[PDB]
Structures are given as structure tokens and as C-alpha cells.
Design a protein around this ligand. Structure first.
Ligand SMILES: *[C@@H]1O[C@H](CO)[C@@H](O)[C@H](O)[C@H]1NC(C)=O
Lengths: 450, 85, 85, 204, 51, 51
């Protein structure tokens, strides 16, 4: 019962393949054993993806687990659709109806929009890049037109890293101009971190700002940077470490040696890697369900050339597809079930907020229930501005020998002393700079005076 | 040049709203300030009254923090009343 | 019961026009009559000024016999001026 | 098809691509060093071994918007040529004081689309928006135009801007007498002697 | 106004001139007494000029 | 006795009421307080009486 399954790991993806191997070890069974053929490539390169796909195809794999990019995703969808080969991926969900593709990653749209509605954001800024596609952008624009939102859409992906210094300073300058504080970051974690560093550098992480990180990796990246900055940060978590399953898995994960499994010694795990693990589970359970239903998908002969025209798909493929889509299991991402098209169904996206002490879950998001909330949670010297007028505020004869509030005498001085006495605060008497009571200048439109 | 009424109103509401947008989340506090800015920019027949008085009142009493957009959308059609006294 | 501005203006132009439609060929003669009746029907902040003064003047100076439709269509967008003075 | 042409040993390829397939063409032409010439929309980035016949429309459009001095308008787009133009005008909207309403008409299926447009222009009636920019292929343009005439929004007071190089390629006789301003872009001048001669030969 | 004497071959601008002359008087309310074909023609012409 | 509602009453506070209601844009119904007192806090029950 050797089951050949191809796989595609982008060069530089370690913890993903580590968790893949861990998944292979844990979900291994005496009945059948998966025999993966791993192929490392450049995920953004369409040619490379095509070649790897046809390589796996000619090898006669029954399924493929991999990743794609905004460039390569159409290659994968079209080829898997033509050759009836099932493709399982942690990478971003496709917008549309794509057959023979099983997308492990949940749709974040609902969670995000519901979060915006939760924080009651009428106007905000949306920072995106074209990596995972513009699907979310389209969504928030349509929802902005429907709910009467004023949204500032800015593409941070087209700015070159070599020349990007003043570009971002100008960006947040233009963003500070309108006084718009609320900001949403939809970006890859690298770009996110870069933007964050630029924010702390320009000091936009101070109080009054609210950042929304849209991704499932909210606690996967370093939050310590802006943690003490005093700005509110909110985000999404697909992996709950409070769950017993995840806790024990984490214990075994943390006990593993780093030499054999790269980057596998950690307290946490990137959500992509976890999705990979759960993907292994889904594949195992799928083929198990195929064997329990007494259906033999075994290949009679070699697949031949994928580019051979006209292409002919194998029959068994459809059966393997249905087998995968009908799977329902429990995993690190929570409840795992799929619809007819292969998108995730019935998930829970934990809604989390970064506080002083650290991150905490403020709620969860369901596809039906939308947002649901979890457990609800000296003296400064008062500056007194005043003007010199008789007998309201006057300078004492000896005033040069005194200092502070003792310098001034008058009705308003005594009144100030009384008010401070009843309200119980320390007060500092100061004379206004321009020496005016108050007015708005007709030209500058600026209020002057006390 | 020439002064209008309707033009003054349509200007008034827009300038108030656009003003309140910078003050988002403190919005219920700054209604009158922004109304001052709108009355200055759009002009007024009686400086005390302002460009549109009824819209100002409607906003002041209705507007709650972050509820701005819906509030303005409800208040912008409101009768300005007499721009004399 | 506020009379706003714009509602009063659009009412003014509408009633003037609808009135002048009743007098064919005499349109240029009856402009002031129809403006009087329109100011009565739509009300005015200042009795002397009327519902929209600038529109009245525009009509008086533009409208020629049988030229009603185009003249009004041109005059209804014009600035009403100061409604209090 | 590309690998078919390749194995045949062609020295160049002339063709078209879609938002889906364009990365395949760029990657393959870049890797196999085969020159690709296309009328289809320009790729955004630096792609070698591709010669894009189509000029960039972005600058023309933005300059036109600045020319008409539009502070607020509605932008109707589809997912066929990509959101590049949309992203551009959104970024420029962020730079300027522009208030832009982005509405995707591409995901609407043609079989069931009747009330979809009535609801669309209903939402467009909500804001009272009389300025509208259509960024779409000529077919969607024509459909949307027919829908506009049906609800009678093609009368005076409305201003439409068609974004494409095909302004005279579609039927304009429909809204020509409507009394609404329509603006657009033309990449082929029929007043030119070359084009005139070509048309003389073409019509025969 | 008699719309029956207008020949279909040359009738384009005849209707535009017709409704221009009808715009002169500002006339909105309009009664069509016609055969179904002429009705359809006049209606289409009305939609074209956006009346 | 021949009138009803807000027309029954006249006075400074009446006119002022009309003005405030006109400025704030609400309909007002003038009513006389039940106990006929302005206001006070009873030292024992701690209950406010009057308007
Ligand atoms: C999960 O499946 C779909 C998700 O959209 C929904 O219709 C269904 O009610 C959900 N089931 C449960 C048990 O929540």
C-alpha cells in the first residue's frame, strides 16, 4: 500500500517541511504509508512550477501538496483542473470556483470585515501588496461602497526596497495630513515587519493609532516591537495553543532536535506549517476513507506526458478529489471540513488584541455567527493659563524675590486657589504667550489666546 | 460675488462633515467647532445663525462617537430654518 | 416648521414657472404677478424680497414672449441672493 | 500551444494573454528566450522578451480627470484586464482630495444580470453621483451603456468617461443624442493619411 | 402634429426637430395616437433624446 | 377654558419655551408639575420632589 504523493516546497521553507515530516510520522499507519517525492523550486516562477508539476505527473503521483504565488497560482489551477490531479495548499485561497484544488487556508474576508464593524470604523487606511491577490481589496472596496466607508487604498508592494526610505515617510505624512489614525495592514509578514519598523522609526506607534494585521499569523511574528509603543494592535489567530491537541503537539514539537528538523525547536509554529501538518492529516484520512469504501485508485500504467495533446485525464482522479473534499477532521486549525469547491468550511478565527502584558484573545469569528466576544475585561500638576489684568491678575511689588504662583496676586489668583482647593489638585499659574484672551484669526483660521 | 442659499447649505453640510472626519472618534465633541469652520468657509447671512442652523442642531443632538457617517447622512437633508435670526 | 432655503427656492421657481405657463405669449408681462403668487405659495423670509429674488430678476430681464421654457430653464439655477435683505 | 510553437522552432511568437495566463507567457518567454509580441494589456513590472503593442493608459486617464477637475466620482471596473488602473487611480486619489467609489461589474454573470445594474445605479443614486468612469472591455461598456439609457441616466447632467483606446470602436450613436457628456481615448486617428489610405483599402 | 406623413427612409432628424419644436413650448404631457409600429418608433426616438 | 394644549398658557417661560423648541427643532407639550413644587431633596427619604 505505497501511496505516491508529490510535493512542492519553496526554497527557504524549512519549518513547513519539518512539520510535513512530523505529520508523516504522526499520521503514519500500518495499513498504508505515504511515499512523498519532495521537489524544491522557485514558487514565483511559472516555468519552474509547470516543470515540477509535469515531473510529479509523469512520476504518477496520486496527489500533490504544494504552494503557489499570485503569478503561479493559475498554472496550478489550470493544470490540476485539466489533468484531474488533486492539489493541496496552505497558500492563499483562490477567488472563484477552482476544481481539483483543496485550500487549507480559511477565508479571512468575513473575519476582517466583521472586525471593522466591531471597532466601528467609518474611515480608515488600507495598506496592501499584490502577493496573495487583490481579492480582499475588492471585497473591502465593495463593502466600503455598500456601508458608506471612506477608505484610502495604498499599494505598498510596488515600492522598491532599494529606494524606499522617504517614500514611507511621505506615505505616513500624507496619512497624517487628514488626521486618519486607524490603519489596516494586509501584507506578507516581511513587508508587515518592514512597515512596522518604519512606523516606530517615524514614531507613529504612539497613542491614538490602531493597527489591524490581517493574516492568520498574528502571534507568529514578533509583537514585542510595538507592544510597549502604546498603540492598539489587533489581529487574527488560526491556532489556539490553549487546546489540548495543540498543547501536546507543541510539547512534542518543542522536544524535537533542531538538527534533524530545521526550525522545529520553538514555543510556537507558523500557521502555514500547521496548515501543512493538518494537510497531511487530511490526505491520510482521505485515502483511508477510500480504502474503507473499498475503492481501488491504483494506477494501471504510467501517466505519460502531461503536455501530450490532446491531454487525457485519468478516471480515478475524480474519486480521489471527492475523497479529499469529503474529509472532516480535527486539527491545529480547528475543525477541518470542505465544500464542493474545496474552500474551507466551518472554521474559527480567533480574534486577538495586543495589550501591555501581551497578546490576548478578545473573541472568535465563525462563518455563520460572525463575531462573538469572549470574556469581557498619579496626580499631575494642573496648568492654569491666565492674563494680566487689574485687579484680576497682577505682579507683586516684591515679585522678583518670589517664584511660581507666589508671583501673582489678584481676584482670579485667589479664585484659582479656591478652585484648586475644592477640586483637590496642584496648580501652576502661567501667563499666556501671545497675551490675548481668545480669537480665531480670519486668515490662518487658528485660535489664539487662552 | 453673488450669494445663494442652497449653495450655502450644500457647502455647509459638506464642510461640517469633512471637518468632523479629522476628529473621528471624538466626533460628538467637535460638531460646533467644525460648524464654525463651515460657517466661515461657506459664509453666512447672519454670523450668529451660521450656514445651516438646523443641520448643526440635528448633528449636535444625534452624533455619537464613530457614528458620524450615518448621522450626517440623516442630518444633511434637514431643514436649515430661517437664516436671518 | 422650518422652511429651509433650498425647498423654498425650488418651490419658488416651480410655482413661478407653472404660473407663467398659464399665460401664453404674455409671459414677459406677467413675470412679477407669478412671482408674487409664488412668493405667497412658497412663503418668504422677507416679504419684500420674496422666495427667490435673483431668479425673479433673471426671469424679468431674460423672458421674452413665447420664450418661456428656455428662459426659465436658464434662470432656475441662478443665485437667489440675500433672502433677508 | 506555446511549447508546441517552441518545438516547431519558431523564431518569434505573436499572441494575446489574460490576467490568468500572462504570467505563463512572461515566465516561459523569459526562460526560453523567445520573443513575444502582443496587443493585450501591458504587464506591470519589468518583463524581458515581451513586446507590448498596447500603450499605457494610466497617465492619459489621470490627466483627463485632473482636466475635468473631478473631486468625486464613481469607478466601474472588471477583473479582466486587471486592477492595475484601479490601484493607480486609488493611489492618486489618496494623493489628491478625490472621493472615489470603486464598483466591480466583472463578477456579475450576463445571464442573470438585469436587476444587478438597477441595484448598482440605485447605490449610485444614493450618493447622487453624476460623474462616472467606465474601465472595461468594449462589450461590458456597451452593456452598461444600454442599461444607462434604459434607466434614463444618459440625459443632461451626467458625465461619463470611457477608459480604453477603443472609444470610437463601440457604438456611440446610442447615447450620442442623450445630452450627457461622454469622453474617451482614441489610439487610431482616422484623419491621418496613412490610416485614411488603410481604411480605403480596408472597406473594399 | 401629423407623424403619419413622414417617410421611414429619411426619418431620423425629423423626429429630433419635432421634439425640439416640442421643447420650445416646454410641452411634457404628450398623447400618441398611432399604429403600434409608429408608436414603437416614436417611443424609441423619445428614449434616444432622453425625454 | 376655550383653548387646549400649549395655547392654554402664556408667559415669559412660555415664549422662551417656544423659542428653545424652535431652535432645537422638537415638538413640545407644556405640562404643569404634579406636586406643584420646584425642587427639593427630602433629608430622610432622599427623594427628589418637584420639577
Ligand atoms: C458550517 O457549514 C456552513 C458554513 O458556512 C454552515 O452553513 C453550517 O451551518 C455550519 N455548521 C455548523 C454546525 O455550524
Amino acid at each position: 500500500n505505497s501511496i505516491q504523493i508529490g510535493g512542492l516546497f519553496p526554497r527557504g521553507a524549512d519549518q513547513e517541511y519539518s512539520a510535513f515530516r512530523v505529520g508523516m510520522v504522526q499520521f503514519s499507519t500500518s495499513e498504508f504509508r505515504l511515499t512523498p517525492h519532495i521537489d524544491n523550486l522557485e514558487v514565483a516562477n511559472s516555468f519552474a512550477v509547470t516543470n515540477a508539476f509535469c515531473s510529479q505527473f509523469s512520476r504518477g503521483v496520486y496527489a500533490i501538496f504544494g504552494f503557489y504565488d499570485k503569478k503561479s497560482v493559475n498554472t496550478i489551477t489550470s493544470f490540476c483542473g485539466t489533468l484531474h490531479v488533486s492539489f493541496i495548499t496552505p497558500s492563499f485561497p483562490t477567488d472563484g470556483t477552482h476544481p481539483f484544488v483543496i485550500q487549507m487556508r480559511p477565508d479571512l474576508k468575513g473575519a476582517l470585515l466583521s472586525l471593522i464593524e466591531y471597532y466601528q470604523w467609518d474611515k480608515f487606511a488600507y495598506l496592501y501588496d499584490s502577493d496573495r491577490g487583490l481579492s480582499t481589496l475588492q471585497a473591502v472596496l465593495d463593502s466600503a461602497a455598500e456601508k458608506k466607508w471612506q477608505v484610502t487604498a495604498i499599494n505598498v508592494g510596488n515600492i522598491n526596497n532599494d529606494k524606499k526610505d522617504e517614500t514611507y515617510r511621505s506615505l505616513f505624512q500624507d496619512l497624517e495630513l487628514k488626521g486618519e489614525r486607524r490603519v489596516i495592514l494586509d501584507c506578507e509578514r516581511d513587508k508587515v515587519n518592514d512597515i512596522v519598523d518604519q512606523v516606530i522609526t517615524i514614531g507613529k506607534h504612539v497613542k491614538g493609532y490602531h493597527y489591524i494585521i490581517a493574516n492568520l499569523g498574528f502571534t507568529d511574528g514578533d509583537l514585542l516591537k510595538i507592544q510597549f509603543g502604546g498603540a492598539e494592535v489587533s489581529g487574527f489567530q488560526i491556532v489556539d495553543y490553549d487546546d489540548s491537541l495543540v498543547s501536546k503537539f507543541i510539547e512534542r514539537w518543542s522536544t524535537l532536535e533542531e538538527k534533524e528538523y530545521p526550525g522545529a525547536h520553538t514555543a510556537t509554529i507558523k500557521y502555514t506549517s500547521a496548515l501543512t501538518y493538518d494537510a497531511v492529516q487530511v490526505m491520510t484520512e482521505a485515502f483511508r476513507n477510500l480504502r474503507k469504501q473499498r475503492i481501488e485508485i491504483s494506477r494501471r500504467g504510467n501517466a505519460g506526458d502531461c503536455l501530450a495533446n490532446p491531454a487525457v485525464p485519468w478516471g480515478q482522479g475524480v474519486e480521489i478529489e471527492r475523497a479529499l473534499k469529503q474529509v472532516q477532521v480535527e486539527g491545529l486549525s480547528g475543525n477541518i471540513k470542505f465544500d464542493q469547491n474545496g474552500k474551507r468550511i466551518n472554521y474559527t478565527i480567533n480574534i486577538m488584541e495586543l495589550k501591555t502584558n501581551g497578546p490576548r484573545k478578545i473573541g472568535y469569528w465563525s462563518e455563520v455567527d460572525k463575531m462573538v466576544v469572549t470574556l469581557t475585561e498619579e496626580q499631575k500638576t494642573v496648568v492654569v493659563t491666565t492674563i494680566l489684568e487689574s485687579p484680576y491678575v497682577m505682579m507683586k511689588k516684591n515679585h522678583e524675590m518670589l517664584e511660581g504662583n507666589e508671583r501673582y496676586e489678584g481676584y482670579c489668583v485667589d479664585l484659582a486657589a479656591e478652585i484648586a482647593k475644592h477640586c483637590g489638585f496642584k496648580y501652576k499659574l502661567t501667563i499666556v504667550g501671545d497675551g490675548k484672551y481668545g480669537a480665531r484669526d480670519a486668515d490662518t483660521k487658528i485660535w489664539d489666546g487662552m | 460675488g453673488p450669494a445663494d442659499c442652497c449653495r450655502m447649505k450644500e457647502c455647509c453640510t459638506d464642510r461640517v462633515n469633512e471637518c468632523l472626519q479629522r476628529y473621528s472618534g471624538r466626533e460628538d465633541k467637535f460638531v460646533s467647532f467644525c460648524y464654525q469652520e463651515a460657517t466661515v468657509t461657506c459664509g453666512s447671512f447672519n454670523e450668529i445663525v451660521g450656514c445651516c442652523y438646523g443641520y448643526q442642531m440635528c448633528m449636535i443632538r444625534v452624533v455619537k462617537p464613530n457614528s458620524l457617517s450615518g448621522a450626517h447622512e440623516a442630518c444633511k437633508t434637514v431643514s436649515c430654518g430661517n437664516p436671518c435670526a
